[PDB]
Design an enzyme around this catalytic site. Structure first.
Site, PDB file in Angstrom:
ATOM      1  N   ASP A   1      16.229 -15.716  21.545  1.00 27.45           N
ATOM      2  CA  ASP A   1      17.238 -14.989  21.597  1.00 27.45           C
ATOM      3  C   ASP A   1      18.587 -15.547  22.317  1.00 27.45           C
ATOM      4  OD1 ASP A   1      16.550 -14.643  24.437  1.00 27.45           O
ATOM      5  OD2 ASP A   1      16.539 -12.470  24.270  1.00 27.45           O
TER       6      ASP A   1
ATOM      7  N   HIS B   1      14.427 -19.496  24.912  1.00 28.13           N
ATOM      8  CA  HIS B   1      13.871 -18.695  23.986  1.00 28.13           C
ATOM      9  C   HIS B   1      14.789 -18.465  22.927  1.00 28.13           C
ATOM     10  CE1 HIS B   1      11.020 -16.802  27.358  1.00 28.13           C
ATOM     11  NE2 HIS B   1      10.426 -18.041  26.703  1.00 28.13           N
TER      12      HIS B   1
ATOM     13  N   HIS C   1      18.850 -19.825  28.454  1.00 28.14           N
ATOM     14  CA  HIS C   1      17.474 -20.366  28.359  1.00 28.14           C
ATOM     15  C   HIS C   1      16.940 -20.766  27.095  1.00 28.14           C
ATOM     16  CE1 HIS C   1      16.281 -16.067  27.913  1.00 28.14           C
ATOM     17  NE2 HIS C   1      15.239 -16.466  27.654  1.00 28.14           N
TER      18      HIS C   1
ATOM     19  N   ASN D   1       7.715  -8.826  27.855  1.00 27.81           N
ATOM     20  CA  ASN D   1       8.013 -10.302  27.385  1.00 27.81           C
ATOM     21  C   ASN D   1       8.308 -10.898  28.765  1.00 27.81           C
ATOM     22  OD1 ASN D   1       8.110 -10.089  24.471  1.00 27.81           O
ATOM     23  ND2 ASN D   1       9.270  -8.543  25.040  1.00 27.81           N
TER      24      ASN D   1
ATOM     25  N   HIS E   1      13.344 -14.735  34.809  1.00 26.82           N
ATOM     26  CA  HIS E   1      12.591 -14.557  33.414  1.00 26.82           C
ATOM     27  C   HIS E   1      12.138 -15.740  32.883  1.00 26.82           C
ATOM     28  CE1 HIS E   1      12.967 -13.053  29.132  1.00 26.82           C
ATOM     29  NE2 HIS E   1      13.426 -14.465  28.857  1.00 26.82           N
TER      30      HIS E   1
HETATM   31  C1  LIG Z   1      11.679 -10.273  22.683  1.00 28.53           C
HETATM   32  C2  LIG Z   1      12.891 -10.382  23.732  1.00 28.53           C
HETATM   33  C3  LIG Z   1      13.491 -11.740  23.879  1.00 28.53           C
HETATM   34  C4  LIG Z   1      12.365 -12.866  23.996  1.00 28.53           C
HETATM   35  C5  LIG Z   1      12.622 -13.461  25.324  1.00 28.53           C
HETATM   36  O1  LIG Z   1      13.663 -14.404  25.598  1.00 28.53           O
HETATM   37  O2  LIG Z   1      11.606 -13.405  26.103  1.00 28.53           O
HETATM   38  C6  LIG Z   1      12.741 -13.876  23.113  1.00 28.53           C
HETATM   39  C7  LIG Z   1      12.560 -13.398  21.698  1.00 28.53           C
HETATM   40  O3  LIG Z   1      13.938 -14.491  22.895  1.00 28.53           O
HETATM   41  N1  LIG Z   1      13.885 -11.293  25.316  1.00 28.53           N
HETATM   42  C8  LIG Z   1      13.531 -10.403  25.866  1.00 28.53           C
HETATM   43  C9  LIG Z   1      13.739 -10.098  27.316  1.00 28.53           C
HETATM   44  O4  LIG Z   1      12.942  -9.144  27.929  1.00 28.53           O
HETATM   45  O5  LIG Z   1      14.505 -10.620  27.526  1.00 28.53           O
HETATM   46  C10 LIG Z   1      13.023  -9.322  24.755  1.00 28.53           C
HETATM   47  S1  LIG Z   1      13.576  -7.919  24.538  1.00 28.53           S
HETATM   48  C11 LIG Z   1      13.459  -6.784  25.996  1.00 28.53           C
HETATM   49  C12 LIG Z   1      11.929  -6.033  25.479  1.00 28.53           C
HETATM   50  N2  LIG Z   1      11.979  -4.744  26.035  1.00 28.53           N
HETATM   51  C13 LIG Z   1      11.331  -3.618  26.340  1.00 28.53           C
HETATM   52  N3  LIG Z   1      12.078  -2.777  26.485  1.00 28.53           N
HETATM   53  C14 LIG Z   1      13.414  -3.237  26.275  1.00 28.53           C
HETATM   54  N4  LIG Z   1      13.300  -4.450  25.964  1.00 28.53           N
HETATM   55  C15 LIG Z   1      14.218  -5.533  25.843  1.00 28.53           C
HETATM   56 CL   LIG Z   2      10.901 -17.689  21.909  1.00 28.03          CL
HETATM   57 ZN   LIG Z   3      13.573 -15.382  27.217  1.00 25.53          ZN
HETATM   58 ZN   LIG Z   4      15.737 -11.964  26.134  1.00 30.75          ZN
END
Ligand SMILES: C[C@@H]1C([C@H](C(=O)O)[C@@H](C)O)=N[C@H](C(=O)O)[C@H]1SC1Cn2cnc[n+]2C1
Ligand SMILES: [Cl-]
Ligand SMILES: [Zn+2]
Ligand SMILES: [Zn+2]
Ligand SMILES: [Cl-]
Ligand SMILES: [Cl-]
Ligand SMILES: [Zn+2]
Length: 231
Positions: free
Chosen positions: A87, A85, A83, A179, A148
């Site tokens: 990461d 984002h 996707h 998120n 997501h």
């Molecule tokens: C900022 C991260 C990232 C972002 C996204 O894709 O939305 C973007 C930066 O790529 N993906 C994440 C997710 O949730 O898939 C979050 S990390 C996730 C949050 N959290 C709370 N407790 C454990 N966790 C792991």
């Molecule tokens: Cl992002």
């Molecule tokens: Zn994401």
């Molecule tokens: Zn993620």
């Protein structure tokens, strides 16, 4: 032995062999004042490698390529981002400079451009409608519907019975949703249902963040998402 968030310094990448010819790659990133781990996949493609997702940033993705060469030693020739984002696509520029052909769906490429994130080069056809599946080298790509994110893909490795859920699937230790600003919370349980119905034979399930498990991770994710919707 699966590495956890406290066992990976930010900037380092670890690999974990899941099955014959299938690895996860694990990196960490500082975000919102926390540190989070993040997974992707590596799948042997004959004498080449198919990469699923970056390692969340340019520095991490350079470390990923180095670790793959040190530990596996086959060239990464193609990468799919699941996707838009960071990461998943953060580091696509590094992959491109290293000669990797980067891919994503048209919807992911468009959303990445809107968001200001790196844009995979190639467009993947055949994934625009919920339930669509296409084979791509040694994996099957599946669009389960919005979860997501509206564009999220999952990846199945038929030879190893490995289901990679990306950020649409939560690890078991995560019991709250976060998120979710780009998520379709209302559709997410239905999209997980489509995954379970299409890949009931999966033995390993890899979330976008955290420890692998079995197919239980799908029901777990539904439970957490529903609890968030109702909160
Ligand atoms: C900022 C991260 C990232 C972002 C996204 O894709 O939305 C973007 C930066 O790529 N993906 C994440 C997710 O949730 O898939 C979050 S990390 C996730 C949050 N959290 C709370 N407790 C454990 N966790 C792991
Ligand atoms: Cl992002
Ligand atoms: Zn994401
Ligand atoms: Zn993620
Ligand atoms: Cl290319
Ligand atoms: Cl190419
Ligand atoms: Zn190309």
């Amino acid at each position: 032995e699966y590495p956890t968030v406290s066992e990976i310094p930010v900037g380092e990448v670890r690999l974990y062999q899941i099955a014959d010819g299938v690895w996860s790659h694990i990196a960490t990133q500082s975000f919102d004042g926390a540190v989070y781990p993040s997974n992707g996949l590596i799948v042997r493609d004959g004498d080449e490698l198919l990469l699923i997702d970056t390692a969340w940033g340019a520095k991490n993705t350079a470390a990923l390529l180095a670790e793959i060469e040190k530990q596996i030693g086959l060239p990464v020739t193609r990468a799919v981002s699941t996707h838009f984002h960071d990461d998943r696509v953060g580091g696509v520029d590094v992959l491109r400079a290293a000669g990797v052909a980067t891919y994503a769906s048209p919807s992911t490429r468009r959303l990445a451009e809107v968001e200001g994130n790196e844009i995979p080069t190639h467009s993947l056809e055949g994934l625009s409608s919920s339930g669509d599946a296409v084979r791509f080298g040694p994996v099957e790509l599946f669009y389960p519907g919005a979860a997501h994110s509206t564009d999220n893909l999952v990846v199945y490795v038929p030879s190893a019975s490995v289901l990679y859920g990306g950020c649409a699937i939560y690890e078991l230790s995560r019991t709250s949703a976060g998120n979710v600003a780009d998520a379709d919370l209302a559709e997410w349980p239905t999209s997980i249902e489509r995954i379970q119905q299409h890949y009931p034979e999966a033995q390993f399930v890899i979330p976008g963040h955290g420890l692998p498990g079995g197919l239980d991770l799908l029901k777990h994710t539904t439970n957490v998402v529903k609890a968030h919707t109702n909160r």
